[PDB]
Amino acid sequence: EPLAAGAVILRRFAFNAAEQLIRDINDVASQSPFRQMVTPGGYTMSVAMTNCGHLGWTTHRQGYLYSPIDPQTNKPWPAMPQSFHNLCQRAATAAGYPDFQPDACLINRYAPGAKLCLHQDKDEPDLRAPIVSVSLGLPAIFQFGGLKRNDPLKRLLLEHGDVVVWGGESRLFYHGIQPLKAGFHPLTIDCRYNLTFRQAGK
DNA sequence: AGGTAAAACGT
DNA sequence: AACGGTATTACCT
Ligand SMILES: O=C(O)CCC(=O)C(=O)O
Ligand SMILES: [Mn+2]
């Protein structure tokens, strides 16, 4: 059974690339550090975030926004690493989205207890483009639902190297991550990373 | 008129 | 602890 219409999980797809990906996460973060963003309502997110590529996802007083500038450094987000771009292209192709051209990569870091409550990815103007989501390090339970928040959820464990792609009919589906269980991973030690690639501009 | 925050407490 | 209320509103543009 496939994940959903237009959605697939490619288990361990990024396993072989993982060590290089993690080195490049560290390189990106050395320029635009991980930070826990504050919601418009004033709550600090448990996930720590940074971005690379032309556009980075951020919170603002006024809402959510894709911006070419890191508001913490006041400099452009770091360029998207070639390792990221290549892995993304290969995964998108395997998932049936060969033409995907991301201009944005959000890097999520989960410490024990960190979560991402059910939400839609909808700040992108071109919804024809899929989301490509790469898991690294400790395992997490990914929720994948429907167009409505109360639509029944699938819960899938995402392990190191797993890639999830959604788009088309499932592009706007609600999804999230349940509070991260503590553990050990030889490459990330005590955390999970996720890379989410999007076409956020035009 | 439409977009939209909640990507965030009680049972 | 899985499910669902809340935005059933108050602001922007
Ligand atoms: O960490 C994940 O697997 C999901 C991340 C996510 O939903 C997002 O970046 O919008
Ligand atoms: Mn998301």
JSON list of C-alpha atoms (C1' of nucleotides) and ligand atoms in Angstrom, two decimals:
[
{"chain": "A", "resi": 1, "resn": "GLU", "atom": "CA", "xyz": [0.00, 0.00, 0.00]},
{"chain": "A", "resi": 2, "resn": "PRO", "atom": "CA", "xyz": [1.41, 3.39, -1.09]},
{"chain": "A", "resi": 3, "resn": "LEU", "atom": "CA", "xyz": [1.41, 6.32, 1.37]},
{"chain": "A", "resi": 4, "resn": "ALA", "atom": "CA", "xyz": [-1.33, 8.33, -0.37]},
{"chain": "A", "resi": 5, "resn": "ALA", "atom": "CA", "xyz": [-2.30, 9.58, -3.82]},
{"chain": "A", "resi": 6, "resn": "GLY", "atom": "CA", "xyz": [0.88, 11.24, -5.11]},
{"chain": "A", "resi": 7, "resn": "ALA", "atom": "CA", "xyz": [2.80, 10.28, -1.96]},
{"chain": "A", "resi": 8, "resn": "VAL", "atom": "CA", "xyz": [5.46, 7.65, -1.32]},
{"chain": "A", "resi": 9, "resn": "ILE", "atom": "CA", "xyz": [8.02, 6.62, 1.28]},
{"chain": "A", "resi": 10, "resn": "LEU", "atom": "CA", "xyz": [11.46, 5.59, -0.01]},
{"chain": "A", "resi": 11, "resn": "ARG", "atom": "CA", "xyz": [12.88, 3.68, 2.92]},
{"chain": "A", "resi": 12, "resn": "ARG", "atom": "CA", "xyz": [16.61, 4.18, 3.54]},
{"chain": "A", "resi": 13, "resn": "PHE", "atom": "CA", "xyz": [16.88, 6.05, 0.22]},
{"chain": "A", "resi": 14, "resn": "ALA", "atom": "CA", "xyz": [19.36, 8.54, 1.73]},
{"chain": "A", "resi": 15, "resn": "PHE", "atom": "CA", "xyz": [21.22, 5.99, 3.87]},
{"chain": "A", "resi": 16, "resn": "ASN", "atom": "CA", "xyz": [24.36, 6.00, 1.72]},
{"chain": "A", "resi": 17, "resn": "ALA", "atom": "CA", "xyz": [24.40, 9.80, 1.41]},
{"chain": "A", "resi": 18, "resn": "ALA", "atom": "CA", "xyz": [23.76, 10.41, 5.11]},
{"chain": "A", "resi": 19, "resn": "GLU", "atom": "CA", "xyz": [27.31, 11.05, 6.35]},
{"chain": "A", "resi": 20, "resn": "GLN", "atom": "CA", "xyz": [27.92, 13.69, 3.68]},
{"chain": "A", "resi": 21, "resn": "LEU", "atom": "CA", "xyz": [24.49, 15.23, 4.29]},
{"chain": "A", "resi": 22, "resn": "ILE", "atom": "CA", "xyz": [25.28, 15.59, 7.98]},
{"chain": "A", "resi": 23, "resn": "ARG", "atom": "CA", "xyz": [28.65, 17.24, 7.28]},
{"chain": "A", "resi": 24, "resn": "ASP", "atom": "CA", "xyz": [26.82, 19.73, 5.07]},
{"chain": "A", "resi": 25, "resn": "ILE", "atom": "CA", "xyz": [24.14, 20.38, 7.70]},
{"chain": "A", "resi": 26, "resn": "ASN", "atom": "CA", "xyz": [26.99, 21.34, 10.03]},
{"chain": "A", "resi": 27, "resn": "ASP", "atom": "CA", "xyz": [28.48, 23.62, 7.36]},
{"chain": "A", "resi": 28, "resn": "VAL", "atom": "CA", "xyz": [25.13, 25.34, 6.76]},
{"chain": "A", "resi": 29, "resn": "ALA", "atom": "CA", "xyz": [24.55, 25.81, 10.49]},
{"chain": "A", "resi": 30, "resn": "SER", "atom": "CA", "xyz": [28.02, 27.31, 10.95]},
{"chain": "A", "resi": 31, "resn": "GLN", "atom": "CA", "xyz": [26.76, 30.23, 8.84]},
{"chain": "A", "resi": 32, "resn": "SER", "atom": "CA", "xyz": [23.04, 30.35, 9.70]},
{"chain": "A", "resi": 33, "resn": "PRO", "atom": "CA", "xyz": [22.79, 28.77, 13.16]},
{"chain": "A", "resi": 34, "resn": "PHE", "atom": "CA", "xyz": [19.97, 26.57, 14.33]},
{"chain": "A", "resi": 35, "resn": "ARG", "atom": "CA", "xyz": [17.42, 28.62, 16.21]},
{"chain": "A", "resi": 36, "resn": "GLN", "atom": "CA", "xyz": [14.06, 27.87, 17.81]},
{"chain": "A", "resi": 37, "resn": "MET", "atom": "CA", "xyz": [11.56, 30.20, 16.17]},
{"chain": "A", "resi": 38, "resn": "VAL", "atom": "CA", "xyz": [8.77, 32.03, 18.01]},
{"chain": "A", "resi": 39, "resn": "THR", "atom": "CA", "xyz": [5.23, 31.68, 16.72]},
{"chain": "A", "resi": 40, "resn": "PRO", "atom": "CA", "xyz": [3.09, 34.75, 16.03]},
{"chain": "A", "resi": 41, "resn": "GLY", "atom": "CA", "xyz": [1.22, 33.79, 19.23]},
{"chain": "A", "resi": 42, "resn": "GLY", "atom": "CA", "xyz": [4.47, 33.99, 21.20]},
{"chain": "A", "resi": 43, "resn": "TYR", "atom": "CA", "xyz": [5.41, 30.34, 21.81]},
{"chain": "A", "resi": 44, "resn": "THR", "atom": "CA", "xyz": [8.90, 29.05, 21.12]},
{"chain": "A", "resi": 45, "resn": "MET", "atom": "CA", "xyz": [8.88, 26.05, 18.78]},
{"chain": "A", "resi": 46, "resn": "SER", "atom": "CA", "xyz": [10.53, 22.91, 20.17]},
{"chain": "A", "resi": 47, "resn": "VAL", "atom": "CA", "xyz": [12.17, 22.15, 16.83]},
{"chain": "A", "resi": 48, "resn": "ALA", "atom": "CA", "xyz": [15.32, 24.15, 16.09]},
{"chain": "A", "resi": 49, "resn": "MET", "atom": "CA", "xyz": [15.55, 25.34, 12.48]},
{"chain": "A", "resi": 50, "resn": "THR", "atom": "CA", "xyz": [17.77, 26.83, 9.83]},
{"chain": "A", "resi": 51, "resn": "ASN", "atom": "CA", "xyz": [17.62, 27.03, 6.02]},
{"chain": "A", "resi": 52, "resn": "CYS", "atom": "CA", "xyz": [19.69, 26.87, 2.89]},
{"chain": "A", "resi": 53, "resn": "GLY", "atom": "CA", "xyz": [19.02, 27.71, -0.73]},
{"chain": "A", "resi": 54, "resn": "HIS", "atom": "CA", "xyz": [17.38, 30.84, -2.08]},
{"chain": "A", "resi": 55, "resn": "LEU", "atom": "CA", "xyz": [14.42, 30.88, 0.32]},
{"chain": "A", "resi": 56, "resn": "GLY", "atom": "CA", "xyz": [14.13, 29.99, 4.00]},
{"chain": "A", "resi": 57, "resn": "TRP", "atom": "CA", "xyz": [10.97, 29.37, 6.02]},
{"chain": "A", "resi": 58, "resn": "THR", "atom": "CA", "xyz": [10.61, 31.57, 9.11]},
{"chain": "A", "resi": 59, "resn": "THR", "atom": "CA", "xyz": [8.10, 32.85, 11.61]},
{"chain": "A", "resi": 60, "resn": "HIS", "atom": "CA", "xyz": [7.45, 36.55, 12.02]},
{"chain": "A", "resi": 61, "resn": "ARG", "atom": "CA", "xyz": [5.23, 38.62, 14.28]},
{"chain": "A", "resi": 62, "resn": "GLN", "atom": "CA", "xyz": [2.77, 38.80, 11.38]},
{"chain": "A", "resi": 63, "resn": "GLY", "atom": "CA", "xyz": [2.76, 35.11, 10.41]},
{"chain": "A", "resi": 64, "resn": "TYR", "atom": "CA", "xyz": [4.93, 32.66, 8.47]},
{"chain": "A", "resi": 65, "resn": "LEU", "atom": "CA", "xyz": [7.13, 33.79, 5.58]},
{"chain": "A", "resi": 66, "resn": "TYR", "atom": "CA", "xyz": [9.66, 32.59, 3.04]},
{"chain": "A", "resi": 67, "resn": "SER", "atom": "CA", "xyz": [12.53, 35.07, 2.94]},
{"chain": "A", "resi": 68, "resn": "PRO", "atom": "CA", "xyz": [15.82, 35.28, 1.02]},
{"chain": "A", "resi": 69, "resn": "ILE", "atom": "CA", "xyz": [17.49, 36.71, 4.14]},
{"chain": "A", "resi": 70, "resn": "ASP", "atom": "CA", "xyz": [18.16, 35.05, 7.51]},
{"chain": "A", "resi": 71, "resn": "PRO", "atom": "CA", "xyz": [16.56, 37.47, 10.02]},
{"chain": "A", "resi": 72, "resn": "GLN", "atom": "CA", "xyz": [19.08, 36.43, 12.67]},
{"chain": "A", "resi": 73, "resn": "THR", "atom": "CA", "xyz": [22.24, 37.08, 10.64]},
{"chain": "A", "resi": 74, "resn": "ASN", "atom": "CA", "xyz": [20.77, 39.60, 8.18]},
{"chain": "A", "resi": 75, "resn": "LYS", "atom": "CA", "xyz": [22.67, 37.73, 5.46]},
{"chain": "A", "resi": 76, "resn": "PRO", "atom": "CA", "xyz": [21.38, 35.42, 2.75]},
{"chain": "A", "resi": 77, "resn": "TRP", "atom": "CA", "xyz": [20.78, 31.81, 3.81]},
{"chain": "A", "resi": 78, "resn": "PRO", "atom": "CA", "xyz": [23.75, 29.62, 2.86]},
{"chain": "A", "resi": 79, "resn": "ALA", "atom": "CA", "xyz": [23.72, 28.19, -0.66]},
{"chain": "A", "resi": 80, "resn": "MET", "atom": "CA", "xyz": [22.02, 24.78, -0.92]},
{"chain": "A", "resi": 81, "resn": "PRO", "atom": "CA", "xyz": [24.80, 22.16, -0.72]},
{"chain": "A", "resi": 82, "resn": "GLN", "atom": "CA", "xyz": [25.31, 20.10, -3.87]},
{"chain": "A", "resi": 83, "resn": "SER", "atom": "CA", "xyz": [24.90, 16.92, -1.78]},
{"chain": "A", "resi": 84, "resn": "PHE", "atom": "CA", "xyz": [21.42, 18.12, -0.73]},
{"chain": "A", "resi": 85, "resn": "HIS", "atom": "CA", "xyz": [20.41, 19.11, -4.24]},
{"chain": "A", "resi": 86, "resn": "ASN", "atom": "CA", "xyz": [21.61, 15.85, -5.81]},
{"chain": "A", "resi": 87, "resn": "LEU", "atom": "CA", "xyz": [19.95, 13.66, -3.19]},
{"chain": "A", "resi": 88, "resn": "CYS", "atom": "CA", "xyz": [16.71, 15.62, -3.54]},
{"chain": "A", "resi": 89, "resn": "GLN", "atom": "CA", "xyz": [16.69, 15.30, -7.33]},
{"chain": "A", "resi": 90, "resn": "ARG", "atom": "CA", "xyz": [17.28, 11.54, -7.17]},
{"chain": "A", "resi": 91, "resn": "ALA", "atom": "CA", "xyz": [14.57, 11.02, -4.55]},
{"chain": "A", "resi": 92, "resn": "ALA", "atom": "CA", "xyz": [12.05, 13.17, -6.42]},
{"chain": "A", "resi": 93, "resn": "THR", "atom": "CA", "xyz": [12.73, 11.22, -9.62]},
{"chain": "A", "resi": 94, "resn": "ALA", "atom": "CA", "xyz": [12.32, 7.86, -7.86]},
{"chain": "A", "resi": 95, "resn": "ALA", "atom": "CA", "xyz": [9.05, 9.14, -6.39]},
{"chain": "A", "resi": 96, "resn": "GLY", "atom": "CA", "xyz": [7.67, 10.13, -9.80]},
{"chain": "A", "resi": 97, "resn": "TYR", "atom": "CA", "xyz": [8.47, 13.85, -9.72]},
{"chain": "A", "resi": 98, "resn": "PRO", "atom": "CA", "xyz": [11.46, 14.07, -12.10]},
{"chain": "A", "resi": 99, "resn": "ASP", "atom": "CA", "xyz": [10.95, 17.77, -12.89]},
{"chain": "A", "resi": 100, "resn": "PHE", "atom": "CA", "xyz": [11.09, 19.08, -9.31]},
{"chain": "A", "resi": 101, "resn": "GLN", "atom": "CA", "xyz": [13.41, 22.08, -8.85]},
{"chain": "A", "resi": 102, "resn": "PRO", "atom": "CA", "xyz": [13.65, 23.14, -5.19]},
{"chain": "A", "resi": 103, "resn": "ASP", "atom": "CA", "xyz": [14.74, 26.66, -4.26]},
{"chain": "A", "resi": 104, "resn": "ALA", "atom": "CA", "xyz": [14.39, 26.13, -0.52]},
{"chain": "A", "resi": 105, "resn": "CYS", "atom": "CA", "xyz": [15.59, 23.68, 2.11]},
{"chain": "A", "resi": 106, "resn": "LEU", "atom": "CA", "xyz": [14.46, 23.83, 5.73]},
{"chain": "A", "resi": 107, "resn": "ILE", "atom": "CA", "xyz": [16.72, 21.99, 8.17]},
{"chain": "A", "resi": 108, "resn": "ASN", "atom": "CA", "xyz": [14.89, 20.77, 11.29]},
{"chain": "A", "resi": 109, "resn": "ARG", "atom": "CA", "xyz": [16.68, 19.52, 14.41]},
{"chain": "A", "resi": 110, "resn": "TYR", "atom": "CA", "xyz": [14.74, 17.48, 16.98]},
{"chain": "A", "resi": 111, "resn": "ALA", "atom": "CA", "xyz": [16.06, 17.03, 20.52]},
{"chain": "A", "resi": 112, "resn": "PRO", "atom": "CA", "xyz": [14.30, 14.55, 22.80]},
{"chain": "A", "resi": 113, "resn": "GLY", "atom": "CA", "xyz": [10.73, 15.74, 23.29]},
{"chain": "A", "resi": 114, "resn": "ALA", "atom": "CA", "xyz": [10.70, 18.00, 20.25]},
{"chain": "A", "resi": 115, "resn": "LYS", "atom": "CA", "xyz": [7.61, 17.82, 18.03]},
{"chain": "A", "resi": 116, "resn": "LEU", "atom": "CA", "xyz": [5.81, 19.42, 15.14]},
{"chain": "A", "resi": 117, "resn": "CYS", "atom": "CA", "xyz": [2.05, 19.56, 15.61]},
{"chain": "A", "resi": 118, "resn": "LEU", "atom": "CA", "xyz": [-0.22, 18.71, 12.67]},
{"chain": "A", "resi": 119, "resn": "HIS", "atom": "CA", "xyz": [-0.03, 21.40, 10.01]},
{"chain": "A", "resi": 120, "resn": "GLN", "atom": "CA", "xyz": [-0.16, 21.91, 6.25]},
{"chain": "A", "resi": 121, "resn": "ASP", "atom": "CA", "xyz": [2.68, 23.12, 4.06]},
{"chain": "A", "resi": 122, "resn": "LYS", "atom": "CA", "xyz": [0.79, 25.90, 2.30]},
{"chain": "A", "resi": 123, "resn": "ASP", "atom": "CA", "xyz": [3.04, 29.00, 2.24]},
{"chain": "A", "resi": 124, "resn": "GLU", "atom": "CA", "xyz": [4.27, 28.03, -1.24]},
{"chain": "A", "resi": 125, "resn": "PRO", "atom": "CA", "xyz": [2.63, 29.78, -4.21]},
{"chain": "A", "resi": 126, "resn": "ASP", "atom": "CA", "xyz": [3.25, 26.93, -6.68]},
{"chain": "A", "resi": 127, "resn": "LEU", "atom": "CA", "xyz": [1.47, 23.87, -5.29]},
{"chain": "A", "resi": 128, "resn": "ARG", "atom": "CA", "xyz": [2.30, 21.78, -8.36]},
{"chain": "A", "resi": 129, "resn": "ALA", "atom": "CA", "xyz": [5.69, 21.09, -6.79]},
{"chain": "A", "resi": 130, "resn": "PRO", "atom": "CA", "xyz": [6.09, 18.21, -4.32]},
{"chain": "A", "resi": 131, "resn": "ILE", "atom": "CA", "xyz": [7.58, 18.22, -0.84]},
{"chain": "A", "resi": 132, "resn": "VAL", "atom": "CA", "xyz": [10.70, 16.05, -0.42]},
{"chain": "A", "resi": 133, "resn": "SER", "atom": "CA", "xyz": [11.46, 15.18, 3.20]},
{"chain": "A", "resi": 134, "resn": "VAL", "atom": "CA", "xyz": [14.67, 13.43, 4.35]},
{"chain": "A", "resi": 135, "resn": "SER", "atom": "CA", "xyz": [15.08, 11.85, 7.82]},
{"chain": "A", "resi": 136, "resn": "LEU", "atom": "CA", "xyz": [18.47, 11.53, 9.56]},
{"chain": "A", "resi": 137, "resn": "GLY", "atom": "CA", "xyz": [19.48, 10.16, 12.97]},
{"chain": "A", "resi": 138, "resn": "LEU", "atom": "CA", "xyz": [17.03, 9.09, 15.67]},
{"chain": "A", "resi": 139, "resn": "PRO", "atom": "CA", "xyz": [13.65, 7.62, 14.60]},
{"chain": "A", "resi": 140, "resn": "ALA", "atom": "CA", "xyz": [10.40, 9.60, 14.79]},
{"chain": "A", "resi": 141, "resn": "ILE", "atom": "CA", "xyz": [6.69, 8.93, 14.34]},
{"chain": "A", "resi": 142, "resn": "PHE", "atom": "CA", "xyz": [5.41, 10.85, 11.33]},
{"chain": "A", "resi": 143, "resn": "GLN", "atom": "CA", "xyz": [1.71, 11.61, 11.12]},
{"chain": "A", "resi": 144, "resn": "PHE", "atom": "CA", "xyz": [0.19, 11.80, 7.66]},
{"chain": "A", "resi": 145, "resn": "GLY", "atom": "CA", "xyz": [-3.49, 12.72, 7.35]},
{"chain": "A", "resi": 146, "resn": "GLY", "atom": "CA", "xyz": [-5.82, 14.32, 4.83]},
{"chain": "A", "resi": 147, "resn": "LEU", "atom": "CA", "xyz": [-7.07, 17.68, 3.57]},
{"chain": "A", "resi": 148, "resn": "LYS", "atom": "CA", "xyz": [-8.93, 18.20, 6.84]},
{"chain": "A", "resi": 149, "resn": "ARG", "atom": "CA", "xyz": [-7.34, 18.29, 10.28]},
{"chain": "A", "resi": 150, "resn": "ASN", "atom": "CA", "xyz": [-9.74, 15.64, 11.62]},
{"chain": "A", "resi": 151, "resn": "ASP", "atom": "CA", "xyz": [-9.09, 13.25, 8.72]},
{"chain": "A", "resi": 152, "resn": "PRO", "atom": "CA", "xyz": [-7.75, 9.90, 10.00]},
{"chain": "A", "resi": 153, "resn": "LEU", "atom": "CA", "xyz": [-3.99, 9.79, 10.52]},
{"chain": "A", "resi": 154, "resn": "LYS", "atom": "CA", "xyz": [-1.45, 7.26, 9.35]},
{"chain": "A", "resi": 155, "resn": "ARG", "atom": "CA", "xyz": [1.45, 6.92, 11.77]},
{"chain": "A", "resi": 156, "resn": "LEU", "atom": "CA", "xyz": [4.71, 5.86, 10.17]},
{"chain": "A", "resi": 157, "resn": "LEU", "atom": "CA", "xyz": [8.04, 5.42, 11.87]},
{"chain": "A", "resi": 158, "resn": "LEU", "atom": "CA", "xyz": [10.70, 7.32, 9.92]},
{"chain": "A", "resi": 159, "resn": "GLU", "atom": "CA", "xyz": [14.20, 5.98, 10.40]},
{"chain": "A", "resi": 160, "resn": "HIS", "atom": "CA", "xyz": [17.67, 7.18, 9.41]},
{"chain": "A", "resi": 161, "resn": "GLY", "atom": "CA", "xyz": [17.85, 7.65, 5.64]},
{"chain": "A", "resi": 162, "resn": "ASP", "atom": "CA", "xyz": [14.11, 7.43, 4.94]},
{"chain": "A", "resi": 163, "resn": "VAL", "atom": "CA", "xyz": [12.72, 9.88, 2.38]},
{"chain": "A", "resi": 164, "resn": "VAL", "atom": "CA", "xyz": [9.08, 10.86, 2.14]},
{"chain": "A", "resi": 165, "resn": "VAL", "atom": "CA", "xyz": [7.63, 12.65, -0.87]},
{"chain": "A", "resi": 166, "resn": "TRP", "atom": "CA", "xyz": [4.16, 14.10, -1.23]},
{"chain": "A", "resi": 167, "resn": "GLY", "atom": "CA", "xyz": [2.45, 16.14, -3.92]},
{"chain": "A", "resi": 168, "resn": "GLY", "atom": "CA", "xyz": [-0.44, 16.34, -6.36]},
{"chain": "A", "resi": 169, "resn": "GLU", "atom": "CA", "xyz": [-3.58, 15.17, -4.57]},
{"chain": "A", "resi": 170, "resn": "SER", "atom": "CA", "xyz": [-1.74, 14.91, -1.25]},
{"chain": "A", "resi": 171, "resn": "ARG", "atom": "CA", "xyz": [0.23, 18.15, -1.55]},
{"chain": "A", "resi": 172, "resn": "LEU", "atom": "CA", "xyz": [-1.83, 19.99, 1.10]},
{"chain": "A", "resi": 173, "resn": "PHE", "atom": "CA", "xyz": [-2.33, 17.07, 3.49]},
{"chain": "A", "resi": 174, "resn": "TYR", "atom": "CA", "xyz": [-1.96, 17.62, 7.24]},
{"chain": "A", "resi": 175, "resn": "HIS", "atom": "CA", "xyz": [1.16, 16.01, 8.71]},
{"chain": "A", "resi": 176, "resn": "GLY", "atom": "CA", "xyz": [3.39, 16.25, 11.77]},
{"chain": "A", "resi": 177, "resn": "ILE", "atom": "CA", "xyz": [5.98, 14.66, 14.05]},
{"chain": "A", "resi": 178, "resn": "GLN", "atom": "CA", "xyz": [5.25, 13.19, 17.51]},
{"chain": "A", "resi": 179, "resn": "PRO", "atom": "CA", "xyz": [7.50, 14.10, 20.47]},
{"chain": "A", "resi": 180, "resn": "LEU", "atom": "CA", "xyz": [10.95, 12.61, 19.80]},
{"chain": "A", "resi": 181, "resn": "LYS", "atom": "CA", "xyz": [11.95, 9.65, 21.96]},
{"chain": "A", "resi": 182, "resn": "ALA", "atom": "CA", "xyz": [15.40, 9.89, 23.53]},
{"chain": "A", "resi": 183, "resn": "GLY", "atom": "CA", "xyz": [18.03, 7.56, 22.12]},
{"chain": "A", "resi": 184, "resn": "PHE", "atom": "CA", "xyz": [21.43, 7.14, 20.52]},
{"chain": "A", "resi": 185, "resn": "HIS", "atom": "CA", "xyz": [22.47, 7.25, 16.88]},
{"chain": "A", "resi": 186, "resn": "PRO", "atom": "CA", "xyz": [26.10, 6.79, 15.78]},
{"chain": "A", "resi": 187, "resn": "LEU", "atom": "CA", "xyz": [25.99, 9.68, 13.28]},
{"chain": "A", "resi": 188, "resn": "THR", "atom": "CA", "xyz": [23.86, 12.29, 15.08]},
{"chain": "A", "resi": 189, "resn": "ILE", "atom": "CA", "xyz": [24.46, 11.12, 18.67]},
{"chain": "A", "resi": 190, "resn": "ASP", "atom": "CA", "xyz": [21.29, 12.40, 20.36]},
{"chain": "A", "resi": 191, "resn": "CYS", "atom": "CA", "xyz": [19.09, 14.10, 17.77]},
{"chain": "A", "resi": 192, "resn": "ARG", "atom": "CA", "xyz": [17.04, 13.71, 14.60]},
{"chain": "A", "resi": 193, "resn": "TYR", "atom": "CA", "xyz": [17.54, 15.97, 11.60]},
{"chain": "A", "resi": 194, "resn": "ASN", "atom": "CA", "xyz": [15.06, 16.45, 8.79]},
{"chain": "A", "resi": 195, "resn": "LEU", "atom": "CA", "xyz": [15.68, 18.18, 5.47]},
{"chain": "A", "resi": 196, "resn": "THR", "atom": "CA", "xyz": [12.60, 19.44, 3.67]},
{"chain": "A", "resi": 197, "resn": "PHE", "atom": "CA", "xyz": [13.02, 20.62, 0.08]},
{"chain": "A", "resi": 198, "resn": "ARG", "atom": "CA", "xyz": [10.41, 22.81, -1.55]},
{"chain": "A", "resi": 199, "resn": "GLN", "atom": "CA", "xyz": [9.84, 25.13, -4.44]},
{"chain": "A", "resi": 200, "resn": "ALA", "atom": "CA", "xyz": [8.89, 28.14, -2.34]},
{"chain": "A", "resi": 201, "resn": "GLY", "atom": "CA", "xyz": [9.16, 30.86, -4.96]},
{"chain": "A", "resi": 202, "resn": "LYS", "atom": "CA", "xyz": [8.43, 30.96, -8.65]},
{"chain": "B", "resi": 1, "resn": "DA", "atom": "C1'", "xyz": [-14.13, 39.25, 0.45]},
{"chain": "B", "resi": 2, "resn": "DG", "atom": "C1'", "xyz": [-10.34, 36.10, 1.21]},
{"chain": "B", "resi": 3, "resn": "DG", "atom": "C1'", "xyz": [-6.63, 34.73, 3.75]},
{"chain": "B", "resi": 4, "resn": "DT", "atom": "C1'", "xyz": [-5.11, 33.12, 8.02]},
{"chain": "B", "resi": 5, "resn": "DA", "atom": "C1'", "xyz": [-2.75, 32.29, 12.90]},
{"chain": "B", "resi": 6, "resn": "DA", "atom": "C1'", "xyz": [-2.73, 27.05, 16.13]},
{"chain": "B", "resi": 7, "resn": "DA", "atom": "C1'", "xyz": [4.28, 24.51, 12.61]},
{"chain": "B", "resi": 8, "resn": "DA", "atom": "C1'", "xyz": [0.65, 26.38, 19.14]},
{"chain": "B", "resi": 9, "resn": "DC", "atom": "C1'", "xyz": [-4.74, 22.62, 26.45]},
{"chain": "B", "resi": 10, "resn": "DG", "atom": "C1'", "xyz": [-8.62, 19.39, 28.26]},
{"chain": "B", "resi": 11, "resn": "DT", "atom": "C1'", "xyz": [-10.54, 14.96, 28.17]},
{"chain": "C", "resi": 1, "resn": "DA", "atom": "C1'", "xyz": [-2.35, 9.24, 25.59]},
{"chain": "C", "resi": 2, "resn": "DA", "atom": "C1'", "xyz": [-5.09, 9.73, 21.01]},
{"chain": "C", "resi": 3, "resn": "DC", "atom": "C1'", "xyz": [-8.15, 12.96, 19.69]},
{"chain": "C", "resi": 4, "resn": "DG", "atom": "C1'", "xyz": [-9.80, 17.16, 18.90]},
{"chain": "C", "resi": 5, "resn": "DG", "atom": "C1'", "xyz": [-11.14, 22.35, 20.49]},
{"chain": "C", "resi": 6, "resn": "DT", "atom": "C1'", "xyz": [-9.55, 26.62, 19.37]},
{"chain": "C", "resi": 7, "resn": "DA", "atom": "C1'", "xyz": [-10.04, 30.96, 14.78]},
{"chain": "C", "resi": 8, "resn": "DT", "atom": "C1'", "xyz": [-17.47, 30.00, 17.20]},
{"chain": "C", "resi": 9, "resn": "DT", "atom": "C1'", "xyz": [-12.36, 35.51, 16.16]},
{"chain": "C", "resi": 10, "resn": "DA", "atom": "C1'", "xyz": [-9.70, 39.42, 15.07]},
{"chain": "C", "resi": 11, "resn": "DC", "atom": "C1'", "xyz": [-6.68, 41.37, 12.18]},
{"chain": "C", "resi": 12, "resn": "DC", "atom": "C1'", "xyz": [-4.73, 42.29, 7.68]},
{"chain": "C", "resi": 13, "resn": "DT", "atom": "C1'", "xyz": [-4.80, 43.30, 2.47]},
{"chain": "D", "resi": 1, "resn": "LIG", "atom": "O1", "xyz": [10.49, 16.52, 10.42]},
{"chain": "D", "resi": 1, "resn": "LIG", "atom": "C1", "xyz": [9.67, 16.09, 9.59]},
{"chain": "D", "resi": 1, "resn": "LIG", "atom": "O2", "xyz": [9.72, 14.92, 9.14]},
{"chain": "D", "resi": 1, "resn": "LIG", "atom": "C2", "xyz": [8.57, 17.01, 9.11]},
{"chain": "D", "resi": 1, "resn": "LIG", "atom": "C3", "xyz": [9.08, 18.44, 8.95]},
{"chain": "D", "resi": 1, "resn": "LIG", "atom": "C4", "xyz": [7.98, 19.32, 8.39]},
{"chain": "D", "resi": 1, "resn": "LIG", "atom": "O3", "xyz": [6.82, 18.93, 8.39]},
{"chain": "D", "resi": 1, "resn": "LIG", "atom": "C5", "xyz": [8.29, 20.64, 7.85]},
{"chain": "D", "resi": 1, "resn": "LIG", "atom": "O4", "xyz": [9.48, 20.98, 7.71]},
{"chain": "D", "resi": 1, "resn": "LIG", "atom": "O5", "xyz": [7.33, 21.37, 7.50]},
{"chain": "D", "resi": 2, "resn": "MN", "atom": "MN", "xyz": [5.48, 20.44, 7.12]}
]
